[PDB]
């Protein structure tokens, strides 16, 4: 009469917590040039999305390599009505990447332009490395995709300084990344959502350096809702790398 037990690897656990969310969603891990997959759908691993927000992160790069930007200038708000009050103020492109301040990085892609934003995306080889006609929001409602698979080797690229971009650039892109520091862990990372296009995509793409200095590389993607609350990303996230040992 003995029962029998329910074995939870990280695996099953990490399937059951998009499950629970009523949504489809993958979490990709890289380090030591090793990937591996964990969700309910791992088919998005290896499927083409828009990036929407963690676009910030090339931006930057591209911005800031091209000498149309520097770390410290502040990007005013000029006055027009944002979608946050929060975003209603002069800021860095720093403290735009942390809010997510679409129209600095707007603002900032027009000042690199067209031409030399589509040349710079095709030298990276991003996604499918395609910009089309509309400056500011080829990110946003395409024709921009990427894979999340894409998005965690370009990020894993960035952690370790391995773009083609100089040192200095990378280096101070990273430094606008970094969202929690604990107990000698570092969590860098950048969210994205989509909302504008169907179905909706979610994106949280960054590293943890752990207290030895590795570098954990990771890449959630899920489809989301409008009802959902932005910080079921991070929420996802944080629970996932628990399970697996990361944090």
Known sequence: ETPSQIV??????????????????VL???????????????????????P?????????????????????????WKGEKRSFTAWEKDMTLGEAMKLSAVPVYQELARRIGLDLMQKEV?????????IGQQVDNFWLVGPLKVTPIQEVEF????????????????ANVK???????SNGYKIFGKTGWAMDIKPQVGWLTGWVEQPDGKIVAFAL????????PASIRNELLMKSLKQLNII
């Open 175 to 181: 430094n606008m990344l970094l969202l929690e520091e």
């Open 155 to 170: 990020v894993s690229q960035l952690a370790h300084t391995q773009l083609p971009f100089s040192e200095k650039v990378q």
């Open 221 to 228: 993607n899920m489809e989301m809702r409008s009802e959902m």
């Open 52 to 76: 929407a927000s963690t676009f910030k992160m090339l931006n930057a790069l591209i911005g800031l390599e091209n000498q149309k930007t520097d770390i410290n200038e502040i990007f005013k």
């Open 28 to 50: 990709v891990i890289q380090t030591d040039k090793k990937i591996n997959l964990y969700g309910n759908a791992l088919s998005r691993a290896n499927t083409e999305y828009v």
């Open 122 to 130: 095709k030298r990276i080889g991003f996604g499918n490395a395609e």
């Open 8 to 25: 939870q690897g990280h695996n099953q656990v990490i399937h059951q917590y998009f499950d629970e969310k009523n949504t489809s969603g």
